[PDB]
Amino acid sequence: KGMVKEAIDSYIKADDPSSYMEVVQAANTSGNWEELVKYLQMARKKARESYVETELIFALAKTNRLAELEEFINGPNNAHIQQVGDRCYDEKMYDAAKLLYNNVSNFGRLASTLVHLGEYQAAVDGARKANSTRTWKEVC
């Protein structure tokens, strides 16, 4: 029936991480990026996967829980950054790729978002370590 809000409590009492792929298929169908957070946060301790962590940081950036989105990554994330970093600028949720690419050091893609951020002092500091044509010219 698509009771994505109600399909969760039927897993809280179970802690069954299975079928999470379809949970995600229904998650993007309706913005509910606060309770999927809890589902994935506890299912973390049941299935040490990567889909869990990728979609977790996606939901975190969706709900802009930056203070702990930045902290989860600093642990053994074992995730796939730059695949949700793609989703940052594809959906254009800036101040997010700023933090994804920071500890991953992808100088060249962050600056494309710092275009829209407004900062220029650190943009050129990202470009001097990039030294790519695209980076320099877009910062200019």
Binding site: R48, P76, N78, S105, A130
Partner: protein, 204 residues
Amino acid sequence: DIKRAVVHTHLLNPEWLVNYFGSLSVEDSLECLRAMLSANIRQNLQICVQVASKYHEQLSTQSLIELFESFKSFEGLFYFLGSIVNFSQDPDVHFKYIQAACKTGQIKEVERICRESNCYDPERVKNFLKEAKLTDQLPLIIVCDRFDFVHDLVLYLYRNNLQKYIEIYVQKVNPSRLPVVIGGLLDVDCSEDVIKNLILVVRG
């Protein structure tokens, strides 16, 4: 309760017992083995594996390996599946044999199968490798470039530490992927003097 061979195993000729269980195992030897492994003494230990290299060829059940790894599996699975990596095409058997190689240091016998086997998901593997930190990382840099997922491996190597890994990689393993690795190092902007020093190494 026919199952009392746990006491006779200290005295009984295991050869004809292997055939006693090759017969009469109408889904029954699973339970007798479960009983023997409930008393998995070092004396009656390997006998559980000598039988095991007969029935896998017809039924390498995941229930068998589940009740197996349910215990320590110090080297039991390594000796069991040491002979089953060949004549197999499953991801789980290879992955769990590899994970059994992490229990006692036998990494030299793992680097061979990373090349030989080509019928497994290295993604779950390399994730586990970074989780169950190998501690002598040196298969991941072989199976990864075997599968060409280096764009993040180079980064992880620079992140943790780089004393030999890239150097011995390009030197021994495959010097054909040096410049792509330098592309990675320049994406992350390693020090240029390190690159000038690294290139001085001999090539293949």
